[PDB]
Design a protein around this ligand. Structure first.
Ligand code: HEB
Ligand SMILES: [C-]#N
Length: 123
C-alpha cells in the first residue's frame, strides 16, 4: 500500500515527527528558526504534510512549501546549509528508529529532493 502505511501509519509518523523535532530543536545550525514557533502546531502541520506526501491522504494540506518558507528566505537568511541540516535530521530520525533502508530512500526521494529544496528555498 501507501508508503505512509508501510511506515506504520498515523502513530509511526507522529512518533517520527516528534523525534525529528527533538533533533531539530537540539541542532544549533537550524534551531534559531523555531525560536518563536508554536511547536505543537508545527508538529501537527508537519504530520499533516507528511501524511499526504507519503500517500496517506487525498489532497495537499496547508501552505505550499514555497509559501510556508518565503519569509525565512527573505528575512531569516534561509539557504542550502539550513535545508541540508533539516533533511539530514529527518534521515537520522528514521535510521535511529531503524526503519528499513528501502523506506528511508523513498522518504528521501520526497524530502531530500532538489524539487523540495527549490520550493523551500524559493528558487
Ligand atoms: C523539506 C524538508 C521541508 C518540509 C517538508 C517542511 C515542512 C513544513 C510545513 C508542513 C510547515 C507548515 C506549513 C503550513 O503552515 O501549512 C513548515 C513551516 C516552517 N518551516 Fe519547514 N519544511 C521543510 C524545510 C525547512 C527548513 C530547511 C527550515 C529551516 C529551519 C524550516 C523551518 C520552518 C519554520 C520556522 C516554519 C514556520 C513558519 C511559520 O509560519 O510559523 N523548514 N515547514
Ligand atoms: C519545517 N519544519
Amino acid at each position: 500500500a501507501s508508503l505512509y502505511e508501510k511506515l506504520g501509519g498515523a502513530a509511526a509518523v507522529d512518533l517520527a515527527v516528534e523525534k525529528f523535532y527533538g533533533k531539530v530543536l537540539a541542532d544549533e545550525r537550524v534551531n534559531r528558526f523555531f525560536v518563536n514557533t508554536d511547536m505543537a502546531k508545527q508538529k501537527q502541520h508537519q504530520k499533516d504534510f507528511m501524511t499526504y506526501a507519503f500517500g496517506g491522504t487525498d489532497r495537499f494540506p496547508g501552505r505550499s512549501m514555497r509559501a510556508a518558507h518565503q519569509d525565512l528566505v527573505e528575512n531569516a537568511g534561509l539557504t542550502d546549509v539550513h535545508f541540508d541540516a533539516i533533511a539530514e535530521n529527518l534521515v537520522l530520525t528514521l535510521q535511529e528508529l531503524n526503519v528499513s533502508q528501502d523506506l528511508i530512500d523513498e522518504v528521501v526521494t520526497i524530502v531530500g529532493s532538489v524539487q523540495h529544496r527549490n520550493d523551500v528555498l524559493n528558487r
